[PDB]
């Protein structure tokens, strides 16, 4: 199939979480959340992530509580049955920008910004893809490419024509920890944050794997030895034939 239709292969960046013994970098997760809140959240929902999961990961119990309370959620009807709102709690899920699909399409030239809860696992390339997409918008499309009105060119997206315009620009965010908010830095951070949203069990999963693999390896090496011992009499057994008179 043509290269344009397939999309440009995303290269392999040196993510700090790549490697069997590597955990996520939690400071990057912390920063990624800010980029998500200040840039992405205007068009992208994050439906599967509950506030409580942030605690002990990227924020404190107090910080998350404040963040949740900035949003109103439907509450149980009062004594008389009329509906009533309520500030958010830790048990709630991060709210999305649109009330329904139709309202989301209207605000984006008819396109639908997907939920990002699983985006890292729902695309070949994973982090490499997401990062590359965000930092891969050329100022001008290659010569000859007739880009439809309202569309944008990005070599990493299949078909090259994507409905999301470039949204990351240098210093559009003021990192709370003082880090220089370059576009590639912000891309690196949200992407790390989105990987955690999709794989919250990552750090713990690899820790368990380490114990599991050590025990199983030992059991394997050990069983070989035990088997050879139990078979030694059979393996070294010897026969002699003396034809009967």
């Amino acid at each position: 199939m043509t290269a344009a239709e397939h999309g440009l292969h995303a290269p392999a960046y040196a993510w700090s979480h790549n490697g069997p013994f590597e955990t996520f970098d939690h400071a990057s997760i912390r920063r990624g959340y800010q980029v998500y809140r200040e840039v992405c959240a205007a068009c992208h929902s994050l439906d599967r992530v509950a506030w409580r999961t942030l605690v002990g990961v990227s924020h404190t119990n107090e910080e998350v509580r404040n963040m949740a309370e900035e949003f109103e959620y439907d509450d149980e009807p009062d004594e008389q049955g009329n509906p009533k709102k309520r500030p958010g709690k830790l048990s709630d899920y991060i709210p999305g920008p649109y009330p329904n699909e139709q309202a989301a399409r209207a605000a984006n030239q008819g396109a639908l910004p997907p939920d990002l809860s699983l985006i890292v696992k729902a695309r070949h390339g994973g982090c490499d893809y997401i990062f590359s997409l965000l930092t891969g918008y050329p100022d001008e499309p290659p010569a000859g490419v007739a880009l439809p009105p309202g569309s944008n060119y990005n070599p990493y997206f299949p078909g090259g024509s994507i409905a999301m315009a470039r949204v990351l620009f240098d210093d559009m965010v003021e990192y709370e920890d003082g880090t220089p908010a370059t576009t590639s830095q912000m891309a690196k951070d949200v992407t790390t944050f989105l990987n955690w949203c999709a794989e919250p069990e990552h750090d713990e999963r690899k820790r368990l794997g380490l114990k599991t693999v050590i025990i199983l390896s030992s059991l394997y090496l050990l069983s070989i030895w035990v088997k050879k011992f139990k078979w030694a009499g059979i393996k070294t057994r010897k026969f002699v034939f003396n034809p009967p008179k």
Binding site: I234, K235, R237, F239, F241, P243, P244
Partner: protein
């Protein structure tokens, strides 16, 4: 495939000097590559025995050949399980790789075929 049939085709090739000089050398090379002789086996020891013809045949085999087949088979399993081959001096030589069970098999197939023929004979008046 019956041994009567393998014999029919094989003998036809063996008689005709055209085919006989063309095939046998190929067949000889095939037999050496097979490798069964390195385990101490004779080809006839390799015939699948779980059928009535082969049971009739093995039953009719003289004692001495029977005890011999038994030793060769046991020796082959033991060598196979040790992942080795026998020392070269113990391999079966071509002169020894004789079709010792073949005559008993052919005889039983003929007896069997005749019964099948006689049980189904039509009659004309």
């Amino acid at each position: 495939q019956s041994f009567t049939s393998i014999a029919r085709i094989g003998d036809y090739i063996l008689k005709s000097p055209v085919l006989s000089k063309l095939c046998v050398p190929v067949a000889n090379q095939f037999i050496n590559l097979a490798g069964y002789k390195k385990l101490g086996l004779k080809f006839d020891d390799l015939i699948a025995e779980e059928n009535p013809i082969m049971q009739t045949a093995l039953r009719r085999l003289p004692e001495d050949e029977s005890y011999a087949r038994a030793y060769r088979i046991i020796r082959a399993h033991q060598t196979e399980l040790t992942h080795h081959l026998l020392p070269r001096n113990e391999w079966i030589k071509a002169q020894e790789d004789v079709p010792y069970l073949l005559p008993y098999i052919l005889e039983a197939e003929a007896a069997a075929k005749e019964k099948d023929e006689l049980d189904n004979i039509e009659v004309s008046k």
